[PDB]
A paper describes a structure:
The etiological agent of RHD is rabbit hemorrhagic disease virus (RHDV), which has a single-stranded, positive-sense, polyadenylated RNA genome of ∼7.5 kb. Mature RHDV virions are spherical, non-enveloped particles with a T = 3, icosahedral capsid whose outer diameter varies between 32 and 44 nm and whose structure is defined by characteristic, cup-shaped depressions. The only capsid protein present in RHDV, VP60, is composed of three domains, which include the N-terminal arm (NTA), the shell (S), and the protrusion (P), the latter of which is further divided into P1 and P2 sub-domains.
Numbering used by the authors:
A (entry chain B): 238 to 433, 435 to 477, 484 to 570, 575 to 579
B (entry chain A): 238 to 471, 483 to 569, 575 to 579
The structure:
């Protein structure tokens, strides 16, 4: 049984989302529907993605480094490799383990990309003991086509390129080819302007061709888990949610065991979330997507008042998940 | 039952160690014994540590940054805070969530510290929408005393300082107080030419609170660490007290009823050739019946894990083990 997968701590600070590695604080309904495969597991113990269920490092040993500058000094470093070139990755060759499943957002100095996934790391050659010191910086990472000359964002893995561009200047850029990329897997959100939205929007998510999509069933609507993720802006400048398909502990549990016997298609495994006032049910589909009986609502659900989580059991997907939330109570 | 906590995938691919977030490939016995509290959970659903059961970004906003040297550029950036100053951390104020439980290894440019814990990040001022860009670099993070003038390693939290120093030069150093440290939780091992450390951290390098329970031999049973392959800068192994999935499971539920002190929950690990028993204490430490042997057990040929149930800690855990395709 998958009942163990979700317990109160998972939604009360133990749990981090599977995309940004930020602490989960809210549930975000997605009536429009969405698709996710990276670091996302199904009840069949499988992923259509390219990443293990952890946030370690993103490494690719065979990429091409370039920069566009009149001068070598103070340029934005660029690196890219073709999707499907990550031969060192056991899970999939589409991209290096932990590479973010978001479409690349193109930008030029002195601007920073809106709603970009950003990580810390740099250019590292396989033959070298250390990364090129001059290149270590915050980098936006994304999927794109047309690198390096005509970058375009893409949400389809096939024919894509895995690209990285520093959002802040590196003291000296490099043109080395081939050369490696090393970036930490836990990301921050780059925004020039204070937005309030959530990232990524469904249109930004990159998936493989076979990836199953999440769509509303009756009054039940797919949800993403909203996390607190640090935001990075204009340098030298005085100073919101990140969303993931699954809580990481759930993702890890699904990876560990095959749950085919427990659930059948047309069924959701259900848990009840109890708040100081009221309660709601959320359901997990066979494809690993979570649902709430929120219908058309896009309002974020605050987890601050969450008191308890307990299993309900397998239930028909067609049956409306309970949504009975009444402010704030000390109870 | 805690039987569910350990399954074959945890030790054969999926499992990542709780210290480095590397992929677990082996079991390393520690005859001398050791202690660990950070990102370590017991069967009472508790930690003596300062970290959540995940690799949370290391964020401390009230630290002091400075650098030492001839000029403001190509200098090693330094940041420090007193242990017990992590007020924003709900778990403990000892250190920021995800700060490594390793004693700081002092070093001078152009050298990289031997067996240092290294993470990527930079100085970030709270009033600023971005980090000080000149400072993003790889940093050694550790517990020390004497900051910033006379750094010395320490394995005790009391009177300690949580410290960071870049192992490679920063474009331009910064002097600010207070200012934040922002470093990713997953770490890389710093290895200098020569030195040749077999695995890190060694027991004498681990930082713990005064209240942390020690892991010591019980009969022929010896406490073990989980060995993982960790990216290195400068075959070297990174070790953690627990597989993270186990740490997460322990955090999720209270297993106090399940086991009694002086008892181990036991599983049998079946290998292509031979088998062995592994036990988990109430303190959350893992044991093998290796006695004084220090052989790295290769989990590559592990084929199955099955629960045995509670057994007295004193009773010997069975140990019955070239290269085989099979």
């Amino acid at each position: 049984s998958p009942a163990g997968l979700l317990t109160t701590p998972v939604l009360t600070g133990v749990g981090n989302d599977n995309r940004w590695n930020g602490q989960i604080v809210r549930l975000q309904p997605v009536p429009g529907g969405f698709s996710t495969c990276n670091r996302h597991w199904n009840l069949n113990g499988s992923t259509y993605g390219w990443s293990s269920p952890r946030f370690a490092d993103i490494d690719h040993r065979r990429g091409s480094a370039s920069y566009s500058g009149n001068s070598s000094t103070n340029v934005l470093q660029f690196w890219y490799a073709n999707a499907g070139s990550a031969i060192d990755n056991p899970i999939s060759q589409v991209a290096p383990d932990g590479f973010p499943d978001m479409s690349f957002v193109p930008f030029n100095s002195p601007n920073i990309p809106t709603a970009g996934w950003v990580g810390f790391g740099g250019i590292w050659n396989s033959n070298n003991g250390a990364p090129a010191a001059t290149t270590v910086q915050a980098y936006e990472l994304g999927f794109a086509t047309g690198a390096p000359n005509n970058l375009q964002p893409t949400t389809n893995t096939s024919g894509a390129q895995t690209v990285a561009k520093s959002i802040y200047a590196v003291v000296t850029g490099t043109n080395q080819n081939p050369t490696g990329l090393f970036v930490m897997a836990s990301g921050v959100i780059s925004t020039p302007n204070a937005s309030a939205t959530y990232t990524p929007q469904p249109d930004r998510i990159v998936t493989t061709p076979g990836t199953p999509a999440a769509a509303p069933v009756g009054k039940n609507t797919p949800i993403m888990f909203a996390s607190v993720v640090r935001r990075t802006g204009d340098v030298n400048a005085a100073a919101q949610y990140g969303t993931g398909s699954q809580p990481l502990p759930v993702t890890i549990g699904l990876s560990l065991n095959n749950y085919s016997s427990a659930l059948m298609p047309g069924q959701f495994f259900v848990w009840q979330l109890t708040f100081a006032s009221g309660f709601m049910e959320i359901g997990l589909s066979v494809d690993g997507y979570f649902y709430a009986g929120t219908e058309a609502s896009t309002t974020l659900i605050d987890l601050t008042e969450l008191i308890d989580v307990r299993p309900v059991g397998p239930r028909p997907s067609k049956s409306t998940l309970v949504f009975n939330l009444g402010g704030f109570s000390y109870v």
